[PDB]
Design a protein around this ligand. Structure first.
Ligand code: MG
Ligand code: MG
Ligand code: MG
Length: 170
RNA sequence: AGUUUGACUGGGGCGGUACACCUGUCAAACGGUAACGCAGGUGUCCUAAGGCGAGCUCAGGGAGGACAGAAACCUCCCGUG
């Protein structure tokens, strides 16, 4: 019934670890991300100096990476094992993307290391349909139109259908 | 002993610099146009903040994401500046 060019898919996954400060803690955090993705992450600096947070401008604060394709689908399932396939209702944004967090990275499938710590991280699945890339192309870029967009209800339907997930009414 | 001891200035002195310059207005839709008219600025700074080329998009806001809160990072959307 539905056009095959409308089926939802995962664009990227966008793991993020926001450590407070720079140094060996951030280097260990980037090591955690590399172990999780098989893929070298990138450090992000602080926009502004905030001394209540102890950060300074242009200081390496966090580490993040984006995963696409089969590897993204694998990492998302690992993260959803920790969450027990239970995403709260408000975890879904109005643009059709959702996300969650985990507190310990060990239960993702990575063995503990005495030197490395107890880092948590953020998962943020960005959903899309085929044809979403026209907003990113260089030549003749465009928007996707109203029907082709993803709503919060459609993203929730996709999660319930694909991962047999449970949406708590929070 | 010789000489000097600025100028403008609603008298002169005191105060200011309207004494060399730049922006908006005055200024009366070309240009020009005065008051110790109004609002301000200048005596610097930059091997890049100069020269090309490439790739990007900014302020702000909305919605989301462990710690993370009104402000830490990540993601999407709107965004004529
Ligand atoms: Mg005239
Ligand atoms: Mg004129
Ligand atoms: Mg260019």
């Amino acid at each position: 019934k539905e056009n095959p060019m409308r089926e939802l898919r995962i664009r990227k996954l966008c793991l993020n670890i926001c450590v407070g400060e720079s140094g060996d803690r951030l280097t260990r955090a980037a090591k955690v991300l590399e172990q999780l993705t098989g893929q070298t992450p990138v450090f992000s600096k602080a926009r502004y100096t905030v001394r209540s947070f102890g950060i300074r401008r242009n200081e390496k604060i966090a580490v993040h990476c984006t995963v696409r394709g089969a590897k993204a689908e694998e990492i998302l399932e690992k993260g959803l094992k920790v969450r027990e396939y239970e995403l709260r209702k408000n975890n879904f944004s109005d643009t059709g993307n959702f996300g969650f967090g985990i507190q310990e990275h060990i239960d993702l499938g990575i063995k503990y290391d005495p030197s490395i710590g107890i880092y948590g991280l953020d998962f943020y699945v960005v959903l899309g349909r085929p044809g979403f890339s026209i907003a990113d192309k260089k030549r003749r870029t465009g928007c996707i139109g109203a029907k082709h967009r993803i709503s919060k209800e459609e993203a929730m339907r996709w999660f319930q259908q694909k991962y047999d997930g449970i949406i708590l009414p929070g």
